[PDB]
Design a protein around this ligand. Sequence first.
Ligand code: NA
Lengths: 431, 458
Amino acid sequence: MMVLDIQLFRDETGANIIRESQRRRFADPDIVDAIIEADKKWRRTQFLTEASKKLINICSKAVGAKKKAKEAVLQLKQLSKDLSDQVAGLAKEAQQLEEERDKLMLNVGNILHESVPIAQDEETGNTVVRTFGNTTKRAKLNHVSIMERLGMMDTSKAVTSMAGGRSYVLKGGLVQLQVALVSYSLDFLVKRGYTPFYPPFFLNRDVMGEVAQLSQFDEELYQVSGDGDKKYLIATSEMPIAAYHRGRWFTELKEPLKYAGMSTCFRKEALGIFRVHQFDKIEQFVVCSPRQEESWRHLEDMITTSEEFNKSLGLPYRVVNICSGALNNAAAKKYDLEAWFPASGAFRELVSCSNCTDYQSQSVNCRYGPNLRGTAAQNVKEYCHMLNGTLCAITRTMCCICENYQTEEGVVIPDVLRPYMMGIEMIRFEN
Amino acid sequence: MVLDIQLFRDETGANIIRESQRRRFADPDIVDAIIEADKKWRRTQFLTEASKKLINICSKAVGAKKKAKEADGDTSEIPPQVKEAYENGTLKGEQVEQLCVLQLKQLSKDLSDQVAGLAKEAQQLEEERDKLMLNVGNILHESVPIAQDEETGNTVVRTFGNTTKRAKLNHVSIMERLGMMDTSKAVTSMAGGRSYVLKGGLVQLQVALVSYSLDFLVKRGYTPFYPPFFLNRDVMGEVAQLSQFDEELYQVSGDGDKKYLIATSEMPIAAYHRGRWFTELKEPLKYAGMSTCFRKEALGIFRVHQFDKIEQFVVCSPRQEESWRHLEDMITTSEEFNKSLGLPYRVVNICSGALNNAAAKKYDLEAWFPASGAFRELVSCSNCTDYQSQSVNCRYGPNLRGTAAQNVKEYCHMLNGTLCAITRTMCCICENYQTEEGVVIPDVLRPYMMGIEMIRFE
Ligand code: NA
């Protein structure tokens, strides 16, 4: 279970910050008190447990000194046993309280940035930050009609009877385009200092729970079985990249860690190729210092990077700031880049960029800085900040390119992609 | 020869199969079992057809009697000889027409029960049948070496490059020193045994190989094909053997019914041709399959559960030995691919006992790994003639109105072969292109990874 850091709840100022954030997200602030109470009883079990373990050795040391002195102890033995009984009792309580606490926390979101719009309904509540290109342009055929006329996409029963609903085959020029986008995307981020990262597409349940919200198991994740422990297919490379930092500790990050995640993603989603179960994606993932609001600076760079990508492709768009009621729990702020689809006549999400601050990193225990011990200055456990953002969701981007670059003869290939597909200038309609 | 169940029913055909089994050091007695299970099966179909006709005769006879106002009759009881005759497939319509309405109605019901019992027998005879067919191989090509054991029985056909040079570090050591491959507990505690993370230059190399491989086949007239990575059980059973389910395939669930992850793009490409009928294939269908592959497998990244692969898949005419010509071109394409990368190798003709059931003949290309001191398989190409096509029912020839029970149904031929198994090729390149400073990028890949000439040790 991925939830917010308990430390912030343990003083009045932080509890007030969380209650305010809850109200601004249209969530329950009264939850903060319930979490504080559950935690207070939990801490009490831990206080008694540590004190009783201490007294177990007083019981042992005493027998050790007495039987050394050859003395007729029988109480000290019984007291060791009973204290060990009490510790076992305290552990069962302690475990129940952790589960109740973490359960309550499922409805506590990350602390909202001060710039998040306050609204419940995305339809009207998102705030438009910037726009690019002719976002009122009109065109003849939608992406579905285009890919059909190209003869290069099959979403018919020949496919769906093999692979189930929303499965597809790509062929020909559209596969060339897909691979052009993967390679160009990778190079685009390499040039901006990202390290390529190719993850496993499976994660164990244990680890998936640390990086995924519990509603994602329900609605989004396929389960894979056979070889060893049960696993889940990844819905994004952000999952395995976040999980790769579990139990790490970065004393300093003068430079952030920047990864260009490359994978196939799988989503249960519980037409054409815009919303499908299986898709390639290139993702930006950043791990940085939690200090001086550095993470906020990287969020601006990441959305800017995605914009520059779409500018290079010549795709018109708007960037929106996602309202408080629609943000997922992990995100303190989220930008979506919504491309304009001129045949369809709609803005459609191609990219989202999120600052999750320490939400994931505290769940995976990715620590930062110096330890509580030794140095008198450190009182709080610090954790790295983590951000993630799409660079290119390949099928969605192909759909957008198809509508924007169509002609009577086919789909013109965006200039920058041509050298990544054998110099091809256009893929042509079958007819 | 057209291998389908029809070949088993012909005496000369049954002998061709028995011989092929013996040449494979496999069981020829299976053939008698398939014949016998099939005979029981055909009997259920003969009875079902007879009884279906008699049910329509019953209905028509009741209709004519009702129209004539014939009395319904004294009893519904069916004569024992009538029951014996439909149980034996010898009940004639003219005898059924002697019965009264009450009897005709009872007989209709009884024949309907008979048809339902026969459909369950039919099914259970098909399962008992194919379970016995599980063990029969494709008819061997005449050029297949006859031996049981690969290590001595394969024939080296052809070699390229310096296959005796040695090198210092194996691919595992190289990828460790690059700092670009993680297979430690940080990864395996996340994703299980044999999982890996690739970083930096090795991802760039991986993508360079995918893109170059695709282009290589596009230039040779292959059509790129990006499949779903899932197949329903139903469909997976038509393109895989039962031993692949147990030993090789991950099961996926959540959305809909259970599916299996693909172990090769050959699987969904074959499956995609199910029920098709190509009347003429003047040119063959050539596909460049591009996918991630998943194998349950029941060091480094040579043998891993998850890997990218580019494959060749051909559907062609079953006539004039055309598929034998395509097998030659396919192995030659894989060879030119490895020559273009500067990798030494040998090509081996796989022996009869080591061939999997679908293949009538198989070439493997085993690349020389100079630090490991060994040939390791990078590529297999095989001609499966009509074995998968018969299972997926991909027919060939005229498809016209008015054709009755076709003495010989023809099916397409299918072939498949690796162009590039990406992780295995990367291991091979690392051994063959290592220097003191890192790994030199093969000339042809450089334009596919930003002109990078070398990836350096950490
Ligand atoms: Na406009």
